[PDB]
Design a protein around this ligand. Structure first.
Ligand SMILES: Nc1ccn([C@@H]2O[C@H](COP(=O)(O)OP(=O)(O)OP(=O)(O)O)[C@@H](O)[C@H]2O)c(=O)n1
Ligand SMILES: Nc1ccn([C@@H]2O[C@H](COP(=O)(O)OP(=O)(O)OP(=O)(O)O)[C@@H](O)[C@H]2O)c(=O)n1
Ligand SMILES: [K+]
Ligand SMILES: [K+]
Ligand SMILES: [Mg+2]
Ligand SMILES: [Mg+2]
Ligand SMILES: [Mg+2]
Ligand SMILES: [Mg+2]
Ligand SMILES: [Mg+2]
Ligand SMILES: [Mg+2]
Lengths: 158, 158
């Protein structure tokens, strides 16, 4: 069950799974057309870099929308099918905002920014869910962030 | 005033100011003897790197202890003079743990790891305060973290 007060970790995980899926899909869908059209800024660095492709955004968005159907059916909350596309967009925007910040700091495309690399999409998606009218408790907002960390390190321990 | 339930941002700021001061002091005190004795690990990277010096740790510890005297006098809570050295140590340990993680990821000494570079000392200090018996609310734990970010970006906007 998902209501407007996100106050347990399973409910956060249901709400956020479209974002997680939107964030993870571009690594398999590939892509080769950069969102930033290859633009370099006056600091010598790409605006976003090659890691952000238009095929990535579309597959991520498509995947997040499809997952929100599953979130809506699993939870009985049909609003999840309407909200999950917007949340997917926030996840995708936050991942790009993180790449933007890495480039401005001189961090080359692909080099690790620990914490930021794992949480940027979560923070964009979280921001959108709040713009949509959801209230998070701070504890469950922290737990979900740590659950994102645990699964990323869970993805790499396998 | 500082009690055992850290539940407002000013009380968190008083408790944490020794850690902030412990974390900031090594950048001026210099230092040239690495904590890691120059050891390189089998992955080819330094254990900690040159950025962690023994003079840094001592000046940081000294500074954090001195600040806890000010925290104890400002708040009327004499236990702050006893706790602030341990909290300073947690701040120093967390900053080293962050450098450790950067080296294992191939991030060279001094290259930016945004978020991690600003929060590692806060997380060590927070861990020690909880080991000491303090309870944080999640909201004030998040606020203080964002206040650390805001001041670091405040340090750089001046
Ligand atoms: N909008 C996106 C997001 C990611 N990806 C693909 O997924 C990979 C991994 O994503 P990410 O780790 O975020 O990109 P990085 O290669 O690490 O680049 P950056 O340093 O900007 O994070 C990218 O290389 C890219 O192949 C994509 O095509 N389009
Ligand atoms: N225990 C410490 C902590 C820091 N410093 C000094 O303060 C500077 C800045 O601290 P920090 O940013 O944490 O070190 P970095 O140079 O960025 O190295 P790292 O990549 O490991 O973070 C260091 O270069 C070093 O001169 C020190 O001497 N001893
Ligand atoms: K990323
Ligand atoms: K640091
Ligand atoms: Mg609820
Ligand atoms: Mg670049
Ligand atoms: Mg990456
Ligand atoms: Mg209190
Ligand atoms: Mg090294
Ligand atoms: Mg640094």
């Amino acid at each position: 069950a998902v209501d407007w007060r996100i106050d347990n970790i399973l409910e956060a995980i249901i709400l956020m799974l479209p974002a997680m899926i939107a964030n993870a899909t571009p690594v398999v869908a590939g892509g080769r057309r950069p969102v930033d059209m290859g633009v370099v800024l006056p600091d010598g660095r790409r605006l976003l870099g090659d890691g952000k492709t238009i095929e990535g955004l579309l597959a991520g968005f498509a995947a997040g929308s499809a997952a929100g159907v599953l979130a809506a059916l699993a939870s009985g909350n049909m609003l999840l099918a309407v909200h999950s596309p917007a949340i997917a967009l926030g996840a995708l925007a936050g991942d790009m905002a993180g790449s933007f910040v890495k480039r401005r700091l001189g961090i080359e495309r692909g080099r690790p920014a620990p914490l930021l690399d794992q949480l940027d999409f979560y923070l964009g998606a979280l921001a959108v869910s709040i713009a949509l009218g959801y209230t998070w408790t701070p504890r469950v907002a922290v737990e979900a962030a740590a659950a994102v960390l645990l699964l990323h390190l869970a993805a790499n321990i396998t």
